[PDB]
Amino acid sequence: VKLAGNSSLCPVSGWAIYSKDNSIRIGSKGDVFVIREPFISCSPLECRTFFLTQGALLNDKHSNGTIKDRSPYRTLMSCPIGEVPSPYNSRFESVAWSASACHDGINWLTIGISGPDNGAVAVLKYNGIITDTIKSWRNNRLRTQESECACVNGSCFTVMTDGPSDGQASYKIFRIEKGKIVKSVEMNAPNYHYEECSCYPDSSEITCVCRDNWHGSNRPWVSFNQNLEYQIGYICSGIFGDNPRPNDKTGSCGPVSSNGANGVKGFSFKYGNGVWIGRTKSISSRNGFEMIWDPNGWTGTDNDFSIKQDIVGINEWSGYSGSFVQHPELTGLDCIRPCFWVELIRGRPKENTIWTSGSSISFCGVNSDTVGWSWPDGAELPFTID
Amino acid sequence: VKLAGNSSLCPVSGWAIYSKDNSIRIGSKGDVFVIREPFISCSPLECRTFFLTQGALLNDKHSNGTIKDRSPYRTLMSCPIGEVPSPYNSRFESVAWSASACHDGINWLTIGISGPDNGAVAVLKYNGIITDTIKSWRNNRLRTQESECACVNGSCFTVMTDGPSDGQASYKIFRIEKGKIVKSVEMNAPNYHYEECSCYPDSSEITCVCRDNWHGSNRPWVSFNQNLEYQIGYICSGIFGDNPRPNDKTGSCGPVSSNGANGVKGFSFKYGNGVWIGRTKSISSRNGFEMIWDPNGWTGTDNDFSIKQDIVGINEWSGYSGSFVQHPELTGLDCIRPCFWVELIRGRPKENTIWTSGSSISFCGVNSDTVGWSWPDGAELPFTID
Amino acid sequence: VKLAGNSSLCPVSGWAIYSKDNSIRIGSKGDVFVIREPFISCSPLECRTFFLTQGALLNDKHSNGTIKDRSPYRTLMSCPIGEVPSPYNSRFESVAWSASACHDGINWLTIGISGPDNGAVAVLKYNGIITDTIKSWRNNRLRTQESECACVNGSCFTVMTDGPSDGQASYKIFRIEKGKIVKSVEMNAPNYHYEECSCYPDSSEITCVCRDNWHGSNRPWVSFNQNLEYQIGYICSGIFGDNPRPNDKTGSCGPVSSNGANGVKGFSFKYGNGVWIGRTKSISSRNGFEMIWDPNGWTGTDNDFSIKQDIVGINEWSGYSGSFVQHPELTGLDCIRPCFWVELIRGRPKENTIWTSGSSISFCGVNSDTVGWSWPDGAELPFTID
Amino acid sequence: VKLAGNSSLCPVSGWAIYSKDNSIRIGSKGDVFVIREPFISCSPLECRTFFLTQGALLNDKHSNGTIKDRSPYRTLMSCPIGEVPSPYNSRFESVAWSASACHDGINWLTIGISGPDNGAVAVLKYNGIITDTIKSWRNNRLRTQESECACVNGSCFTVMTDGPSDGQASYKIFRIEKGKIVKSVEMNAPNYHYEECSCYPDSSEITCVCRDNWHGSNRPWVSFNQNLEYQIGYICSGIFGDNPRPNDKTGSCGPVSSNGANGVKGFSFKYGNGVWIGRTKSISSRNGFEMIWDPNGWTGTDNDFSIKQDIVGINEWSGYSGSFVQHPELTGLDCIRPCFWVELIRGRPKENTIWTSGSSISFCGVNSDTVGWSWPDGAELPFTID
Ligand SMILES: CC(=O)N[C@H]1[C@H]([C@H](O)[C@H](O)CO)OC(C(=O)O)=C[C@@H]1NC(=N)N
Ligand SMILES: CC(=O)N[C@H]1[C@H]([C@H](O)[C@H](O)CO)OC(C(=O)O)=C[C@@H]1NC(=N)N
Ligand SMILES: CC(=O)N[C@H]1[C@H]([C@H](O)[C@H](O)CO)OC(C(=O)O)=C[C@@H]1NC(=N)N
Ligand SMILES: CC(=O)N[C@H]1[C@H]([C@H](O)[C@H](O)CO)OC(C(=O)O)=C[C@@H]1NC(=N)N
Ligand SMILES: *[C@@H]1O[C@H](CO)[C@@H](O)[C@H](O)[C@H]1NC(C)=O
Ligand SMILES: *[C@@H]1O[C@H](CO)[C@@H](O)[C@H](O)[C@H]1NC(C)=O
Ligand SMILES: *[C@@H]1O[C@H](CO)[C@@H](O)[C@H](O)[C@H]1NC(C)=O
Ligand SMILES: *[C@@H]1O[C@H](CO)[C@@H](O)[C@H](O)[C@H]1NC(C)=O
Ligand SMILES: *[C@@H]1O[C@H](CO)[C@@H](O)[C@H](O)[C@H]1NC(C)=O
Numbered sequence A, B, C, D: 001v002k003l004a005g006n007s008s009l010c011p012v013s014g015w016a017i018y019s020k021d022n023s024i025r026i027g028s029k030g031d032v033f034v035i036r037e038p039f040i041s042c043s044p045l046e047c048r049t050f051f052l053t054q055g056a057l058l059n060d061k062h063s064n065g066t067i068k069d070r071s072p073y074r075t076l077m078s079c080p081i082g083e084v085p086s087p088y089n090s091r092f093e094s095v096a097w098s099a100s101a102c103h104d105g106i107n108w109l110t111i112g113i114s115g116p117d118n119g120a121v122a123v124l125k126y127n128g129i130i131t132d133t134i135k136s137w138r139n140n141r142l143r144t145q146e147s148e149c150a151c152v153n154g155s156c157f158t159v160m161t162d163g164p165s166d167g168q169a170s171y172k173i174f175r176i177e178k179g180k181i182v183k184s185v186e187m188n189a190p191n192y193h194y195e196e197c198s199c200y201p202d203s204s205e206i207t208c209v210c211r212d213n214w215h216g217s218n219r220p221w222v223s224f225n226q227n228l229e230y231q232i233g234y235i236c237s238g239i240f241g242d243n244p245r246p247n248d249k250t251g252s253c254g255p256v257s258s259n260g261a262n263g264v265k266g267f268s269f270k271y272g273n274g275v276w277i278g279r280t281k282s283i284s285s286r287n288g289f290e291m292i293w294d295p296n297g298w299t300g301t302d303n304d305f306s307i308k309q310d311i312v313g314i315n316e317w318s319g320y321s322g323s324f325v326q327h328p329e330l331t332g333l334d335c336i337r338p339c340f341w342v343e344l345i346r347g348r349p350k351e352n353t354i355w356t357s358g359s360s361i362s363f364c365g366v367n368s369d370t371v372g373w374s375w376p377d378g379a380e381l382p383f384t385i386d
């Protein structure tokens, strides 16, 4: 049966640890894929870990130069949550160097972008069967969420970006039914920059928190209903969400130009005028991670918060993060549960190796007692292959 | 429920990438079978990758001399599409150095040919249970499709060849029900040569595009109905389909003797008087791959085409190719979807190794935007074992 | 359907061997997790082996320093009984350095304790979904059974400990329904010490046999009904159950202070005034294992027994042991079958390696002919990595 | 539904190849169990390969001294037919150095014998749950079929042996229902020797062809009905079935004392007064294998045959062989199909290695065209570990 998506988000006071795979530690001897850009998505029965492979195993010579973002060898694959991405336990999804996946209640939807940087094609699959296609319309690295898409009342929604990563680009919202695109709208967003959106369903509508790689150290957001009537803006909080970023001063409801160039994929959960910000602890590199509750952060511009929860220590490597949700028809709850994952990147450019990969931790939002701690990657680099 | 097979082929303007396994790259460290002659076939539930193993793993000493075509150690096995052929994730099918497989809607049919070159026996299995047998009738390397068989209204059809590979041989069409041969007809084809046919269902009838190893650089074809009433001929197009071949001149509706000796397994889709030819880019070796749409290529002899789509680059290794189809009762579409796979051969005779193996890419025919690119094997030879 | 848990324990005269995984022997070359604290639990369909990983494989550098009890890399995972804990065949359960699991008849309940030693959090999952949480209330290493919990008429029960391991601590019994804590009671037990309880259902009530790490070489027990009305005491037998321990003299119904400090996790089955004691053969280290039937051992203090069955030889390594049960709705029997497992620890501190791990054997209680023997670990240390 | 077992054996003129695993060749690099005594058994859904592990992998140090027959580390495990016995794809069955397994139509029955040579215990499991037990009654290596048991109308039947292997021993037939022994009869067989019986169902009755290790180069047989009313005798054929054996002279209906000491496990199918003998090609060692049809071999004593089919070449290693059957409710046929497997032993005592193991081939009896050939093991010894 289709996921309704009409209920609100569950009240959350803390984040309980859900999964840890230990990919790089196990990959030291085991047959584990060299991956990056992992994300979690749930069906009514199970939650799966999606990831973009480099078509190579850890501690093997083919992992050479895997800092490279896009190649013909990259494939989207999935394994059960908390397990290592192995050739022996992973399910093939698509050929992709950029990806998105979600379950509507009946079947899996996957989106796999492959091809040249000037003509990339998104291949849409519903239950493993190709159902539609989208070509790059700006001929400049067609790219998508790198996290799960959002589904409401039988439709699934995604955001795609085409154009430069250091200037004004083109941003489109898609409405997809049974793997077929039924509607799409280009966003009227001058001076905005949307990339790698973390989108979640809330009260029959979708909220995406994205990455401004152009000139924003705070995060851009986009909200829309099923007809794709959207709103745009930035998170106003003085507690900035991207990386790199400045120190916490007064925030802006437009793009914070200071330390605005570059970025990292992230997420945030809106609760009225308040926001749950997940961010790196460091302001200059991808190190550490923390959940922060700013009761006025979504619309207000000050740098105040009432809750901080440690996830990864200041001196430990982190990386990508993203939102996922668990629906009522999975949990039995009457609200939509917010969860998140964190990618822990190891290797290049920061470490003296020939390779780049990442493992994953995940947390779910509860309304009971929790604790801050550091759950780092734990691998001892360099490897035999280095 | 049985596959009907009464509908036409879906209109196709381009080919979207469906799967890539990265077998040789992963096999560098992982436990991956040394294979050749892979093919894809689909049930109403899933698509599987079939392959002929050499009974040995990559980067192991037992892969020595695996350029050899036929041995007692070769077995037909299958794994899910896009996954690596591993001993830990593959299903055993038959003991075979030549194979064919297809799903009638209810159960899998596999055909496995093993035995001596002068008395080979095809073992037919329906749902894993031996249901029939065929002995070599010319005592000269009984061989079959190396791709999937075609099924229409509860029957499945195959083509087998017995005799020389550089002269006139014997060619038989088989009709199989629930694993048992109910009818067979020898083809009256003097001056023709049929080997390794790629067969597909279309409007309650079967079209096979095969390999003329004798004296044909263009491809032979055979069409038949359920009663095995057949027609024979060659693809008339001036864009020649086999490898090795000449340059593109005026074609013939008989065998093109020029560069006619030897060959490679291939496929083609008939659309009225038009043909979708898949072929190597090189004319002298198994390198590159491209899809070409000749609107008049099936019956006309000129060398004109209106669409060319790149699949594998001119300098990159390719190999075998074959057709597969997805039926309406799998896709939900009202037509039969044409797809294809490409084997990418690495090692002997062209490379300085002790072994020979191949990985696989696959594409499905869509009527929306697509792109040409190169999706090569990607392995760095020689291996530690060499 | 829910497990009733109203029937008695089956009469047992001997213990038949149920499973042996050979983890360390296979882990010498294979990809097997470095584990400790394994336990078995059964659903109405299957029995599974639960275990706490160190997030590393055997014979790999990441197994360095795995004598360490608690880390952020430890995860609770399960595989089918008798199989090796491998990344390729194991199911992820929780992030935990202390664990408990049980099936109520409908779904799995897992309890995973992770976090700092002064703020640890137990994460409760029902069918893989977080359903509740418990924080450390003494801020001193919140710890649980390391064996399966007990379930009766739709509820599941566990025991947790918080405080010192060489003095008076705090002990709580929990009643859990569908993953949610519905009732909890702190035990009024001055001069008692409860740790790592082996709990089993018997006649709609629960009996736990635990570990007194403080000052007891005999084992403490706690019995309770569904409303958590409990009784406390020690096993009176002169045949002492813990390790280290003294020689067999007259026992006490209170804690036997002699050789009382430290300990090991164990189990015992009450049959009226009689007890089935499972214990190490050695009195100073974790070596050997034996089942002993003392017809008066539960309430009487003498050192007499009528049955002794050998399990592991005196010179062979053992370790943890625990109870598990098989219910009527699994076996078809009209009573609850008692079974047990034994962890066989190899490596540090007793062996010259960089690592510590354990394999597992298991036995079930039958009322027919059996035999004593030694089923040791069988691995030849040190390993290549040492 | 229960297997009826009332129908006759299918008429067989030849043997088509069913499976080949290539265990030792793949085990050279892959993680494959060191095994011996493999056998095949089928349920109404699938056929499985059962095998006795040594609790160690090939090309690992723990495979040292695996020529040893009985240890505490040996376990009975099963994997799907034609697949390699791997820790990642195998199901655990029992702890055993002697085994038997069969499916009654509803659930699997396994028999696992472990323990000391003077007190061994057979542990009976039905659907993975211990249901009964048998102790050694002669205190001299209690041993069983090493092949599948036979099932008729809801009961399953086995043969066990206790006593010396070079003199008169004790032989018992068991009738088992739902894992419980309901009847057993000791065979009145003075001057006979029964070991490692291959038993099959035929017309509501069971025929076992066994091994005379004492003084018989021809094979002993035992037939019985469901009430265990038995007949005993030897295969009269002048074509002797065991190994070692003499040359083919006139046979005896009693034990052929000439070259009678020692032996190997085998099988034979009775068809009236005729017999399908499977045997090694060599008369002094375990080399080669062949199927021979003697139309008068069961009751007549001459050395004539009308069909010989090659299976393994004279210079290639063989080993154990055994019968298996496929029932009507699996095949859809109205008769019981006879099949067989062959173990191909490699290593000690005949080869310069530290280990001993075996791979497996299997054939099923068809009434259509077949071929003789050699399907050897194919591994190149010694291994890196030697
Ligand atoms: C499609 C693509 O190449 N996306 C890039 C991403 C991107 O370049 C930035 O957002 C700027 O546009 O950068 C990063 C990154 O780690 O910052 C990795 C992503 N790699 C992959 N998704 N494979
Ligand atoms: C049955 C058999 O040996 N088929 C051969 C095939 C064949 O020799 C040619 O078509 C000429 O007859 O050649 C090739 C080839 O790569 O050209 C591989 C096939 N190998 C395997 N299918 N194993
Ligand atoms: C939670 C925790 O650290 N438990 C410890 C346990 C414990 O220290 C003693 O019972 C004393 O309190 O000791 C041992 C032990 O081998 O004795 C291992 C356990 N390790 C793990 N369960 N990981
Ligand atoms: C139970 C047992 O040890 N059975 C032995 C078997 C036996 O010794 C002979 O039949 C003589 O009694 O010999 C052989 C053999 O290869 O000849 C292997 C078997 N090994 C195993 N089944 N593990
Ligand atoms: C969710 O959908 C159901 C079924 O349509 C309906 O009962 C309910 O109103 C929706 N939830 C909310 C919170 O409106
Ligand atoms: C990686 O690639 C670089 C250059 O492409 C080369 O110099 C180096 O040797 C490679 N390293 C390995 C381990 O293959
Ligand atoms: C396919 O078979 C169905 C059922 O027999 C029938 O409705 C239809 O006519 C067939 N399709 C075509 C295109 O004729
Ligand atoms: C492969 O075989 C050839 C001859 O058969 C031999 O000379 C060579 O050493 C072998 N190579 C390996 C790696 O086993
Ligand atoms: C077990 O529960 C069933 C169903 O409620 C009941 O028949 C029975 O009384 C209980 N068993 C015992 C031993 O009381």
Ligand SMILES: *[C@@H]1O[C@H](CO)[C@@H](O)[C@H](O)[C@H]1NC(C)=O
Pocket (backbone or CB within 6 Å): C061, C064, C065, C354, C385
């Ligand atoms: C283990 O760690 C110690 C110190 O932490 C170090 O000296 C040693 O080299 C390590 N051993 C291995 C095999 O990594």
Ligand SMILES: *[C@@H]1O[C@H](CO)[C@@H](O)[C@H](O)[C@H]1NC(C)=O
Pocket (backbone or CB within 6 Å): D004, D006, D007, D008
């Ligand atoms: C097999 O059993 C069925 C059902 O009892 C019966 O029809 C038949 O007589 C039996 N088969 C034979 C060959 O007697």
Ligand SMILES: *[C@@H]1O[C@H](CO)[C@@H](O)[C@H](O)[C@H]1NC(C)=O
Pocket (backbone or CB within 6 Å): D061, D064, D065, D354, D385
């Ligand atoms: C095997 O064992 C023997 C003696 O038990 C020993 O001499 C030899 O070194 C061992 N070999 C290996 C490879 O472990």
Ligand SMILES: *[C@H]1O[C@H](CO)[C@@H](O)[C@H](O)[C@H]1NC(C)=O
Pocket (backbone or CB within 6 Å): A152, A153, A154, A204, A226
């Ligand atoms: C979509 O589903 C049903 C039927 O189309 C409709 O009643 C429901 O309100 C719609 N979902 C929404 C509005 O989210």
Ligand SMILES: *[C@H]1O[C@H](CO)[C@@H](O)[C@H](O)[C@H]1NC(C)=O
Pocket (backbone or CB within 6 Å): B152, B153, B154, B204, B226
């Ligand atoms: C075969 O199936 C049915 C019943 O035999 C028949 O009606 C149908 O037309 C046949 N299939 C064809 C002609 O493709």
Ligand SMILES: *[C@H]1O[C@H](CO)[C@@H](O)[C@H](O)[C@H]1NC(C)=O
Pocket (backbone or CB within 6 Å): C152, C153, C154, C204, C226
């Ligand atoms: C709990 O289950 C049912 C319904 O609540 C009740 O009848 C039964 O007696 C209770 N279980 C017990 C007392 O163990």
Ligand SMILES: *[C@H]1O[C@H](CO)[C@@H](O)[C@H](O)[C@H]1NC(C)=O
Pocket (backbone or CB within 6 Å): D152, D153, D154, D204, D226
């Ligand atoms: C056993 O099964 C049924 C019911 O007990 C009986 O009718 C049948 O004849 C028996 N099976 C035999 C005789 O093989």
Ligand SMILES: [Ca+2]
Pocket (backbone or CB within 6 Å): A211, A212, A213, A214, A215, A216, A217, A218, A242, A243, A244, A259, A260, A261, A262, A263, A264
């Ligand atoms: Ca930015």
Ligand SMILES: [Ca+2]
Pocket (backbone or CB within 6 Å): B211, B212, B213, B214, B215, B216, B217, B218, B242, B243, B244, B259, B260, B261, B262, B263, B264
């Ligand atoms: Ca040719």
Ligand SMILES: [Ca+2]
Pocket (backbone or CB within 6 Å): C211, C212, C213, C214, C215, C216, C217, C218, C242, C243, C244, C259, C260, C261, C262, C263, C264
């Ligand atoms: Ca103690």
Ligand SMILES: [Ca+2]
Pocket (backbone or CB within 6 Å): D211, D212, D213, D214, D215, D216, D217, D218, D242, D243, D244, D259, D260, D261, D262, D263, D264
């Ligand atoms: Ca003999």
